[PDB]
């Protein structure tokens, strides 16, 4: 039939977009998920285009 | 503050060399009483060491010889690490409970259960709160929080949105959230948002934003007494009786169950047991029924060390009609070692008066200190210590910057010592009401 799966209804776990470690925090500015203040420090001073790449690694985008 | 200057306020500890238990001639506010301070330090060591259970120590000596001061010095040199219960023996004559029950509760208060636990606490400044309240309420909402090091946004579950609205949490508020309970404490208002707080009056304080991670595990080390566990288990709000009183006589089978459970927690390693001290001030106010209970209460494994002070000589035991040393029955005195306090020498009185003149904001001229020392020898340490306050108040009436002999002389003249008070009584026996009820009111 070639139509053959559906999304899960379970809530997904949250991982840091940078280091992949678990992420308690979601940055409201760039919407990257991050592990700790050390990674937040690099996120907020990323080269301007890089934020969309960390999203795109999980298929997320601003648009 | 709310602590005023009081008779023991100068006692900061026991004044003993911790490396050797050698008492220093003076330190930490204790003067002399060296052998008694050494013995109290040996008791202090085995209190901290915990391995020894249910020993009773009596401190015996004339009034004003530092018995309470040594008791206060031990309490100050144990601190929070060990439960310290102070009981005036007058206190157990309750109308709510029998005196052996009151005396049981005092022993139970003196053993701590130390329980070590963690929680994740989230703390920071609220950047904003959105709650839709979509008729209806608490449907959905987002929370932004920052420290100085991080900012994060959270979707809130509905029972958290109730908590936020219950605490009227607002942009700029510095909050802690305990996650597992979900209680919110507003630690303060952030200074940067001060302009927003138009309803807050100018008396309002403000704070700097928190620092570090928004979330961390903070470990709390609770210590809860056996008495508190006993009272908690009495009724559906048993703890509420830990404040108002109105505990009954707690049933023995409740205590016996709790002792078994606390032995389980110890063996399971979930809790430590922390033996404290019960200090019974003026233990001779107890009666013969009390001493009989104490004798076997001390044989319990979960007994504190009991420390006791008595003024009394060979004196009538209460609740009977015969006399014994300290007013304590010999069968009880068989279970007790005794520390003696001696009277002070004139230089020790001078030093105690000096210390008391440091704790009170008083300047004594050297001749005023010499006169108070002489008065202390003649009229007792306590009376000369009460002349210190009196002399400062008289000096301030004459606007003097230092207390002079004139002020001490006015004090001695205005306020009688016990001996002159007795002599006044022994002269006024016709004007004072006698033990016969007889009195003459005529001139
Ligand atoms: N050795 C001492 N060092 C410092 N202050 C003392 C000393 N002995 C007694 N005092 C103080 O003098 C007063 C009387 O002593 P206190 O300990 O109350 O005697 P008692 O308890 O035997 O009546 C208290 O204010 C106490 O703090």
Q: After which residues is the backbone of chain A broken at C–N > 2.5 Å?
A: none
* Cα–Cα distance for residue pair B109/B226, rounded to 1 Å: 6
B12 in contact with ligand 1, CB cutoff 6 A:
no
* Cα–Cα distance for residue pair B57/B42, rounded to 1 Å: 11
Residue B276 backbone class (left: φ over 0; alpha: ψ -120 to 50; beta: rest): beta
Query: B129, B152, B212: best mutation site toward chain A, by most A Cβ within 10 Å?
Result: B152
Contacts of B68 by beta carbon, 8 Å cutoff, 6+ apart: B8, B281, B309
Residue A43 CA, distance from chain mean position: 11
Sign, CA dihedral B122-B123-B127-B128, equals: positive
Contacts of A26 by beta carbon, 8 Å cutoff, 6+ apart: A14, A32, A33, A34, B152, B153, B154
Q: Are the C-beta atoms of residues B102 and B89 closer than 8 Å to each other?
A: no
Beta strands in B18-110 (DSSP E): 22-23, 26-27, 30-31, 56-60, 84-88
Q: Are the C-beta atoms of residues B78 and B278 closer than 8 Å to each other?
A: no
- The helix-helix angle for B366-379 and B381-397 (nearest 10°) equals 140
B29 in contact with ligand 1, CB cutoff 6 A:
yes
Q: Are the C-beta atoms of residues B28 and B15 closer than 8 Å to each other?
A: yes
Residue pointed to by tokens 């004559």: B93
B66 is in an annotated binding site: yes
B30 in contact with ligand 1, CB cutoff 6 A:
yes
Q: Are the C-beta atoms of residues B18 and B37 closer than 8 Å to each other?
A: no
Pairing mode, strands B56-60 and B336-340: parallel
Sign, CA dihedral A14-A20-A24-A25, equals: negative
The coordinates were experimentally obtained by: cryo-EM
Q: Give the closest residue to A25 by CA, choosing from B161, B181, B151.
A: B151
> CA distances (Å), B376 to each of B36, B61, B106, B407, in order?
22, 18, 37, 16
Residue pointed to by tokens 């169950």: B257
Return the number of other C-beta atoms located less than 10 Å from residue B160's C-beta: 18
- Rounded to whole angstroms, the maximal C-alpha distance in chain A is 49
* Cα–Cα distance for residue pair A43/A53, rounded to 1 Å: 12
**DSSP letter for each residue of B213-264:** -SEEEEEEEEEEEHHHHHHHTTSTTGGGHHHH-------HHHHHHHHHHHHH
* Cα–Cα distance for residue pair B101/B80, rounded to 1 Å: 26
CA distance A33 to chain B (A): 9
Pairing mode, strands B173-178 and B111-131: antiparallel
Tell me the residues of B at the A interface, defined by beta carbons under 8 Å apart: 127, 144, 147, 149-154, 212-215
Contacts of B96 by beta carbon, 8 Å cutoff, 6+ apart: B245, B246, B247, B248
Half-sphere exposure of B137 (CA within 13 A, CB side): 8
Pairing mode, strands B336-340 and B84-88: unpaired
Sign, CA dihedral B102-B281-B80-B303, equals: negative
Q: Tally DSSP H helices, then E strands, for chain A.
A: 2, 2
Return the number of other C-beta atoms located less than 10 Å from residue B388's C-beta: 24
* Cα–Cα distance for residue pair B249/B231, rounded to 1 Å: 10
Return the number of other C-beta atoms located less than 10 Å from residue A4's C-beta: 5
* Cα–Cα distance for residue pair A39/B247, rounded to 1 Å: 55
B137 in contact with ligand 1, CB cutoff 6 A:
no
Contacts of B27 by beta carbon, 8 Å cutoff, 6+ apart: B13, B15, B16
CATH number of B346-425: 1.10.8.60
Distance from Cα B67 to the centre of ligand 1, integer Å: 7
Q: Are the C-beta atoms of residues B70 and B13 closer than 8 Å to each other?
A: no
Structure tokens at B341: 């306090």
* Cα–Cα distance for residue pair B97/B109, rounded to 1 Å: 16
Q: Are the C-beta atoms of residues B94 and B102 closer than 8 Å to each other?
A: yes
List CB contacts (< 8 A) between B212 and chain A: 37
Measured in degrees and rounded to the nearest 5, phi and psi for residue B345 equal: -80, 160
Supply the residue whose CA is at minimum distance from atom 25 of ligand 1: B7
- The helix-helix angle for B99-108 and B288-297 (nearest 10°) equals 30
Structure tokens at A57: 């690694």
Q: Are the C-beta atoms of residues B325 and B331 closer than 8 Å to each other?
A: no
Q: How far apart are the first and last CA of chain A?
A: 31
Supply the residue whose CA is at minimum distance from atom 9 of ligand 1: B66
* Cα–Cα distance for residue pair B297/B291, rounded to 1 Å: 10
Q: Give the closest residue to B122 by CA, choosing from B191, B216, B261, B40.
A: B216
B12 is in an annotated binding site: no
List CB contacts (< 8 A) between B213 and chain A: 36-37
Final resolution, Å: 2.9
> CA distances (Å), A34 to each of A12, A62, B19, B148, B172, in order?
16, 17, 51, 16, 23
3-class secondary structure per residue, A23-37: CCEECCCCCCEECCH
């Amino acid at each position: 039939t070639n139509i053959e799966s559906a999304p899960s209804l379970a809530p997904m776990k949250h991982y840091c977009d940078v280091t992949g470690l678990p992420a308690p925090y979601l940055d409201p500015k760039t919407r990257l998920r991050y592990h700790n203040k050390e990674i937040f420090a690099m996120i907020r001073n990323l080269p301007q285009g890089m934020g969309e790449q960390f999203l795109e690694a999980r298929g997320a985008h601003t648009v | 503050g709310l602590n005023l200057i009081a008779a023991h306020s100068h006692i900061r500890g026991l004044g003993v060399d911790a490396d050797t238990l050698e008492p220093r001639p003076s330190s930490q506010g204790l003067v002399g009483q060296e052998k008694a301070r050494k013995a109290a330090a040996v008791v202090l060591e085995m209190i901290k060491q915990g391995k020894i259970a249910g020993r009773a120590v009596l401190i015996a000596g004339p009034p004003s010889t530092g018995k309470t001061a040594i008791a206060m010095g031990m309490a100050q040199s144990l601190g929070q690490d060990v439960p310290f219960t102070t009981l005036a023996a007058s206190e157990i004559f309750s109308l709510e409970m029998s005196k052996t029950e009151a005396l049981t509760q005092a022993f139970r208060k003196s053993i701590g259960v130390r329980i070590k636990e963690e929680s994740e606490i989230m703390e920071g400044e609220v950047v904003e709160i959105q709650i839709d309240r979509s008729t209806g309420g608490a449907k959905q909402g987002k929370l932004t929080i920052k420290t100085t090091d991080m900012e994060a946004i959270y979707d809130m579950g509905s029972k958290m949105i109730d908590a936020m609205t219950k605490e009227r949490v607002m942009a700029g508020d510095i909050i802690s959230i305990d996650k597992s309970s979900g209680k919110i404490t507003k630690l303060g208002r952030s200074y940067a948002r001060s302009r927003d707080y138009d309803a807050m009056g100018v008396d309002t304080k403000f704070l700097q934003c928190p620092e570090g991670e928004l979330q961390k595990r903070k470990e709390v080390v609770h210590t809860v007494s056996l008495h508190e566990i006993d009272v908690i288990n009495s009724r559906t709000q048993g703890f509420l009786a830990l404040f108002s009183g109105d505990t009954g006589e707690i049933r023995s089978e409740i205590r016996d169950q709790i002792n078994t459970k606390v032995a389980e927690w110890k063996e399971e390693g979930k809790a430590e047991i922390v033996p404290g001290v019960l200090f019974i001030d003026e233990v001779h106010m107890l009666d013969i029924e009390c001493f009989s209970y104490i004798n076997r209460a001390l044989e319990s494994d979960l007994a504190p060390i009991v420390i006791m002070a008595s003024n009394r000589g060979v004196s009538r035991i209460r609740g009977t009609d015969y006399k014994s040393p300290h007013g304590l029955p010999l069968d009880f005195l068989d279970r007790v070692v005794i520390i003696n306090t001696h009277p002070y020498t004139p230089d020790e009185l001078r030093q105690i008066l000096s210390i008391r003149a440091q704790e009170e904001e008083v300047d004594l001229t050297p001749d005023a200190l010499a006169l108070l020392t002489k008065i202390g020898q003649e009229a007792g340490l306590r009376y000369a210590s009460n002349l210190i306050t009196t002399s400062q108040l008289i000096a301030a009436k004459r606007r003097a910057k230092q207390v002079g002999v004139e002020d001490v002389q006015r004090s001695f003249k205005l306020f009688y010592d016990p001996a002159r008070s007795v002599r006044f009584v022994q002269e006024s026996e016709k004007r004072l009401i006698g033990n016969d009820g007889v009195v003459d009111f005529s001139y």
